[PDB]
Amino acid sequence: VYAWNRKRISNCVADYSVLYNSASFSTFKCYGVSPTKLNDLCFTNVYAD
Amino acid sequence: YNYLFRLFRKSNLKPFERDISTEIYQAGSTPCNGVGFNCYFPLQSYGF
């Protein structure tokens, strides 16, 4: 946690449903945006830490 | 915590519609059985 790996996500299609429909997680949350709407929205850049 | 709002619904409210429902909300492709993960109580509090 002192040295987190960041991935930059770009030039690709992002199926967030593979995250939010998966029972593989002890917690899942989204802020300012509904997770089901992330299958419609498009972004200049995305980042994963 | 005495004040609450509805965080989720199956469809948007019509003009001057009112909905007191405490039924569990199905947030994804999971069977919720009216009782957890992707199966949330739709009323939530600001905690002012």
The Cβ-side half-sphere exposure at B45, using a 13 Å CA radius, reads 5
Over the range A6-29, which residues count as b (16 or more CB within 10 Å of their CB) and which as e?
eeeeeeeeeebeeebbeeeeeebe
Q: Which helix (H) or strand (E) segment is A17 a member of?
A: helix A17-20
Experimental technique behind these coordinates: cryo-EM
Lookup result for tokens 């909300």: B25
Q: Nearest C-alpha of chain A: how many angstroms from B48? A: 19
Say if A16 is an interface residue toward chain B (CB within 8 Å).
Answer: no
Q: Of B26, B30, B29, which Cα lies nearest the Cα of B40?
A: B26
d(CA B48, CA B43): 15
Amino acid identity for residue A25 in this structure:
F
Using DSSP's 3-state secondary structure scheme, residue A46 falls into strand
**Residue A47 contacts B, CB cutoff 8 Å:** no
Between CA A28 and CA A5 the distance in angstroms is 19
Closest chain B residue to A16 measured between Cα atoms?
B28
DSSP string, B1-48: ---EEE---SSPPPTT------PPEE-SSS--TT--TTEE-SEEE---
Which segments within A1-49 are labelled E, that is strand?
A: 7-9, 46-48
Query: Which CA distances in Å does B34 have to A4, A45, B27, B40?
Result: 39, 38, 12, 9
Structure tokens at A22: 């998966």
